């Protein structure tokens, strides 16, 4: 049986909801097949987000970690292939930090690849009738920061963990004033559950 | 005052296997909410025949309100239509091979008909339930606009007391697995159409927002 | 033979410093191209007043063909308009503070007027020159659609011999430096408008 | 005087024109300020593209290398910040190669950063009225392959050379049958020349 830690962020910008936390909160305590899921919220703040993730890692001793974030504008569930060593914020984080041209780990690699079997995950989500695709950029805001920090912590200190990041679209209630694509919270939650079960079931990806 | 609301959705088209406009309205057949009593009928995705089928459904049900529904793939909101235009301009053929170009729907009829539904109220009530919606000012020139214009022409000429109009819906997620595109779940689309029926049943007059 | 073609473009609108619809049509003022003799006049971005200025330009030039031009930011092609609708629905005010909502342009006038230009021919002749173009079925509900409906209404009621219509153009690149959006160069837009004027002067009939 | 080598791609399937090559060809032999420019064409083929680039580098001994490719759908000139070590092709290249899940360099790093002052380049192009922005993904097709292979060569053999990649949008004549954003070939060419001059004038970014 594998313990899967999912994280979601609190609302950022002028938002009042973040579908990443709303979806992962629903899966706290869920178990299916080889997966047992636990969820933790991470603040949308550079540096502090990584400290909170490390605390959740110590609390839960997970085998698999899937950090989730919102990518407004996207139309599919998108597991991320690669995290980059760069904080480049177009807007400030929830405490006002707005780093530009900053390394996340000084002397760390330019990038880290995901440790999750994302092609299998994309296919299992599509099998269930929900759109999904691999993404090759997680941005340069707090989501990519958390993804790079997670892979760095895994590489250096906990290599047994299979970890990675999945971005999700807006939910419909976030698109009432400006037209934008969304996926329902029910579908996003289902996709994240499929991701957790798939990662727990397979260490190895397909081609 | 109870109002009978006729909803229509289209039969299967475009290489698709599911026409979501029908999947959604079929769920509402026989539904009763607020002052709305809803009945649903399927219309073929065929120029000319679609309007004959609509007229037959109108005769069968004697509706007070009519809301014809079709799919506008690519849109990201539920979009009640403001205006129907007197033109069939098909870039691909319909289910029976008809591909009209530059054709009037009603020869000598008006260039356009405005909707008879309180669409600004419908957009606001859908958004109050957390579902995106907006007024659209073009229903295209394919069978959806054809049905809308035909519906308004039949109301104007033969049953002016009927309040009718058209609403387009986006793709549902299952239609966007091979080529990315925006969608809304069938559950949210069905709920939005139910809201539109109840809103039109409850209010003859639109708001001015 | 010769056909007098009146082209219009709009005056500056806030936030902008030059309106490209005018910048392009002004370049064609006095041009003799094929059977077209082109003259250009500027119209204010104001409900009601725009139509009065158009009427004066019609009296002044006695045109045979009238093409009003406006900008539809976000579009990716030159787009001649098929239909004008009898509605002013403004999400922001015009240049003189008018923000009509749910208002008829002509009380008792038809719900719509079709264009009088050979727009399919125009689209094909523009594409023949390597410039993107397509027919549009909505001119919006702001001042552009307003001027289009008013032009067709004035033609129908008072000068039925005139062939009139409306063409929207995209942003120019210089308008897309702070927020990404499609554009076409001022040179390509000017060339497309010249082709439209020549095409309309050479053909009353559409393909 | 800095020798700047620009590359553009050969004709690709469906197109009869590769605008990255049409634009850089115009600049072959151009001299402006501190830049002396030369251009070379590379085939849209995995592995062979890198061989042609290495030969061009041997011939010209450039100080600066800017490889250019087309990213249909974008609406700005986009210098790339990062190349990744992966060939993942959804369509075949011009010689039928369709690599899936393959490293570009076995044992090379997951990514390389660009060596060009791309923020300066973006700003100088916008000063001339042309849209531009930094991109953080060059894709996983032949363009990213050429970019990663370039950075691996620089690391490898000539660390002083400053190199990178810039994607350009479609030109209007490629958007007649299916609508899409574009920039004129003259504006793309001017932007690429600004990039070359900016890179030659400045080793450091802003």
GROMACS .gro file of C-alpha atoms in nm, chain C residues 76-77 127 130-133 173-174 176-185 188, chain D residues 75-76 126 128-132 172-173 175-177 179-184 187:
model
   40
  492UNK     CA    1  -0.636   3.772  -3.690
  493UNK     CA    2  -0.765   3.865  -4.030
  543UNK     CA    3  -0.607   3.642  -4.974
  546UNK     CA    4  -0.109   3.692  -4.922
  547UNK     CA    5  -0.312   3.874  -4.655
  548UNK     CA    6  -0.553   3.686  -4.422
  549UNK     CA    7  -0.923   3.770  -4.456
  589UNK     CA    8   0.187   4.532  -3.390
  590UNK     CA    9   0.268   4.852  -3.203
  592UNK     CA   10   0.044   4.468  -2.878
  593UNK     CA   11   0.363   4.541  -2.689
  594UNK     CA   12   0.227   4.537  -2.333
  595UNK     CA   13  -0.027   4.257  -2.371
  596UNK     CA   14   0.008   3.987  -2.632
  597UNK     CA   15  -0.248   3.981  -2.914
  598UNK     CA   16  -0.261   3.911  -3.287
  599UNK     CA   17  -0.190   4.188  -3.531
  600UNK     CA   18  -0.130   4.272  -3.898
  601UNK     CA   19   0.112   4.540  -4.017
  604UNK     CA   20  -0.066   4.499  -4.503
  698UNK     CA   21   0.203   3.635  -3.153
  699UNK     CA   22   0.542   3.771  -3.055
  749UNK     CA   23   0.969   4.630  -2.838
  751UNK     CA   24   1.119   4.928  -3.238
  752UNK     CA   25   0.743   4.859  -3.211
  753UNK     CA   26   0.752   4.479  -3.259
  754UNK     CA   27   0.600   4.244  -2.999
  755UNK     CA   28   0.840   4.023  -2.807
  795UNK     CA   29   0.072   3.619  -4.286
  796UNK     CA   30   0.086   3.415  -4.601
  798UNK     CA   31  -0.243   3.193  -4.225
  799UNK     CA   32  -0.476   3.213  -4.524
  800UNK     CA   33  -0.660   2.880  -4.486
  802UNK     CA   34  -0.672   3.165  -3.899
  803UNK     CA   35  -0.372   3.220  -3.678
  804UNK     CA   36  -0.157   3.513  -3.555
  805UNK     CA   37   0.138   3.629  -3.760
  806UNK     CA   38   0.403   3.898  -3.794
  807UNK     CA   39   0.532   4.029  -4.127
  810UNK     CA   40   0.917   4.286  -3.900
   0.00000   0.00000   0.00000
